[PDB]
Motif scaffolding. Structure first.
Motif, short mmCIF file in Angstrom:
data_model
loop_
_atom_site.label_atom_id
_atom_site.label_comp_id
_atom_site.label_asym_id
_atom_site.label_seq_id
_atom_site.Cartn_x
_atom_site.Cartn_y
_atom_site.Cartn_z
N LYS A 174 0.85 -1.18 0.00
CA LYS A 174 0.00 0.00 0.00
C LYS A 174 0.88 1.22 0.00
O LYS A 174 1.82 1.29 0.77
N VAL A 175 0.55 2.20 -0.82
CA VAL A 175 1.21 3.51 -0.81
C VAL A 175 0.27 4.45 -0.05
O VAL A 175 -0.80 4.85 -0.57
N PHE A 176 0.66 4.81 1.17
CA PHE A 176 -0.14 5.74 1.98
C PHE A 176 -0.03 7.15 1.43
O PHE A 176 1.03 7.58 0.95
N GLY A 177 -1.12 7.90 1.60
CA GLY A 177 -1.09 9.33 1.45
C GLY A 177 -0.37 9.89 2.66
O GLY A 177 -0.32 9.26 3.73
N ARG A 178 0.17 11.09 2.55
CA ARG A 178 0.91 11.70 3.64
C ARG A 178 0.05 11.85 4.93
O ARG A 178 0.45 11.44 6.01
N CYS A 179 -1.11 12.48 4.82
CA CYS A 179 -1.97 12.66 5.99
C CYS A 179 -2.57 11.35 6.48
O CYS A 179 -2.75 11.17 7.68
N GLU A 180 -2.83 10.43 5.57
CA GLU A 180 -3.32 9.11 5.91
C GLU A 180 -2.28 8.41 6.80
O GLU A 180 -2.64 7.86 7.84
N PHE A 201 6.54 6.24 1.46
CA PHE A 201 5.23 5.87 2.01
C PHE A 201 4.69 4.55 1.46
O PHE A 201 3.52 4.25 1.63
N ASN A 202 5.56 3.70 0.90
CA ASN A 202 5.17 2.41 0.33
C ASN A 202 5.45 1.32 1.33
O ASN A 202 6.61 1.01 1.59
N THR A 203 4.41 0.64 1.83
CA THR A 203 4.57 -0.44 2.77
C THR A 203 5.30 -1.64 2.18
O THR A 203 5.91 -2.38 2.93
N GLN A 204 5.31 -1.80 0.86
CA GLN A 204 5.97 -2.95 0.22
C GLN A 204 7.44 -2.70 -0.10
O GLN A 204 8.08 -3.58 -0.68
N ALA A 205 8.01 -1.52 0.23
CA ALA A 205 9.40 -1.21 -0.06
C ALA A 205 10.36 -2.22 0.59
O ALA A 205 10.20 -2.56 1.77
N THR A 206 11.36 -2.66 -0.15
CA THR A 206 12.42 -3.51 0.39
C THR A 206 13.75 -3.05 -0.20
O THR A 206 13.80 -2.55 -1.34
N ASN A 207 14.84 -3.23 0.53
CA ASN A 207 16.16 -2.92 0.02
C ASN A 207 17.17 -3.84 0.65
O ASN A 207 17.22 -3.98 1.86
N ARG A 208 17.96 -4.45 -0.18
CA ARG A 208 18.98 -5.38 0.23
C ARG A 208 20.24 -4.60 0.64
O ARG A 208 20.73 -3.77 -0.14
N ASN A 209 20.78 -4.91 1.81
CA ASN A 209 22.01 -4.31 2.33
C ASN A 209 23.21 -5.15 1.88
O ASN A 209 23.08 -6.32 1.51
N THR A 210 24.39 -4.52 1.88
CA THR A 210 25.61 -5.17 1.43
C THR A 210 25.95 -6.44 2.22
O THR A 210 26.47 -7.41 1.65
N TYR A 224 12.85 -3.56 5.42
CA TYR A 224 11.47 -3.81 5.03
C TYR A 224 10.50 -2.73 5.49
O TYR A 224 10.54 -2.29 6.64
N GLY A 225 9.60 -2.37 4.59
CA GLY A 225 8.44 -1.56 4.91
C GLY A 225 8.62 -0.08 4.94
O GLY A 225 9.63 0.47 4.51
N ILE A 226 7.59 0.59 5.47
CA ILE A 226 7.52 2.05 5.48
C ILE A 226 8.72 2.71 6.16
O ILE A 226 9.08 3.83 5.78
N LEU A 227 9.27 2.06 7.17
CA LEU A 227 10.41 2.57 7.92
C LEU A 227 11.65 1.71 7.73
O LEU A 227 12.62 1.86 8.45
N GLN A 228 11.68 0.87 6.69
CA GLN A 228 12.87 0.15 6.27
C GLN A 228 13.61 -0.50 7.45
O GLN A 228 14.79 -0.26 7.69
N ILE A 229 12.88 -1.32 8.17
CA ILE A 229 13.40 -2.00 9.34
C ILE A 229 14.26 -3.19 8.92
O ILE A 229 13.86 -3.99 8.09
N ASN A 230 15.47 -3.30 9.50
CA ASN A 230 16.49 -4.24 9.07
C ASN A 230 16.39 -5.61 9.72
O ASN A 230 16.35 -5.72 10.94
N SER A 231 16.51 -6.68 8.88
CA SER A 231 16.51 -8.07 9.34
C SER A 231 17.80 -8.44 10.10
O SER A 231 17.83 -9.49 10.73
N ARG A 232 18.86 -7.61 10.03
CA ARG A 232 20.10 -7.87 10.76
C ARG A 232 19.79 -7.94 12.24
O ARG A 232 20.38 -8.75 12.93
#
Ligand SMILES: [Cl-]
Ligand SMILES: [Cl-]
Ligand code: NA
Length: 129
Positions: free
Chosen positions: A1-7, A38-47, A53-61
């Motif tokens: 889900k892509v949240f709106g800013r105020c949402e 604001f995308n709940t599905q965002a993911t980024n792989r670290n070196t 993962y998620g809106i606040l990019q919380i790390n699996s480390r």
């Protein structure tokens, strides 16, 4: 889900993030903007092989289990996929633990580099909260 800013601001406030550990709501919205757009599905792989993962990019480390980060911790006691849900509850509860660690919101690199010291209240301007 892509949240709106105020949402997203309203959901974060309802879940108790506003002024959590002294960080006003604008700080959290700003962090989410630059961590995930604001995308709940965002993911980024670290070196190191961990993933954020998620809106606040919380790390699996340290904070969630994804089954593919050997020797990592799961300090929020959740599957990392729970941080991708349209419902932000798991991301908020885990962010409360992260911000309670020694470095506060400096744990979020995008917050330190793009939000810290700026007019963060502008991120909630115009919202009905
Ligand atoms: Cl604010
Ligand atoms: Cl793992
Ligand atoms: Na982990």
């Amino acid at each position: 889900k892509v949240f709106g800013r105020c949402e997203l601001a309203a959901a974060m406030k309802r879940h108790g993030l506003d002024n959590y550990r002294g960080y006003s709501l604008g700080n959290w919205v700003c962090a989410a903007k630059f961590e995930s757009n604001f995308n709940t599905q965002a993911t980024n792989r670290n070196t190191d092989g961990s993933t954020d993962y998620g809106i606040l990019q919380i790390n699996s480390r340290w904070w969630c289990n994804d089954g593919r980060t050997p020797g990592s911790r799961n300090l929020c006691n959740i599957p990392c996929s729970a941080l991708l849900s349209s419902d932000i509850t798991a991301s908020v509860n885990c962010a409360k633990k992260i911000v309670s660690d020694g470095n506060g919101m400096n744990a979020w690199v995008a917050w330190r580099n793009r939000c810290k010291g700026t007019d963060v209240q502008a991120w909630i301007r115009g919202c009905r909260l």
